[PDB]
Amino acid sequence: TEEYRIGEIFLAATEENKPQVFANAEKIVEQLKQGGSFVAYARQYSEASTAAVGGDLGWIRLAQLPTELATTAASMGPGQLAGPVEIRGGFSILYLIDKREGHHHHHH
């Protein structure tokens, strides 16, 4: 019943350019782990339509994510960064902003 508030920075890459784009993504992860604003980096680097909103995907269920990201998100601890994670069209960096669960809504 878990729902996840996830932030994402997506960098597109053809198979030929993947190693290079992975390098670019890793440098971003390094800056984020050292304190950089996820929103700022997402607005500057994300190639997904959510870039403008700081990469915030809002509250989502894991089935909404591609397998690679869903399985990564399932093991993440709150407030942590993950990636870069390879997906068919490139690489994604994830940020677990919030998390909630429970079979009953009136319990929050």
Report resolution (Å) to 1 decimal: 1.5
Q: What is the 3-state secondary structure (H, E, C) of 13-49?
A: CCHHHHHHHHHHHHHHHHHHHCCCCHHHHHHHHCCCC
Asked if residue 19 has a cis previous peptide bond (ω within 30° of 0), the answer is no
Say how many C-beta atoms besides its own lie within 10 A of residue 14's C-beta. Answer: 9
Experimental method: X-ray
At the top level of CATH, which class does the domain 1-108 belong to?
Answer: alpha beta
Q: Would you give the DSSP letter of residue 63?
A: G
Say how many C-beta atoms besides its own lie within 10 A of residue 21's C-beta. Answer: 18
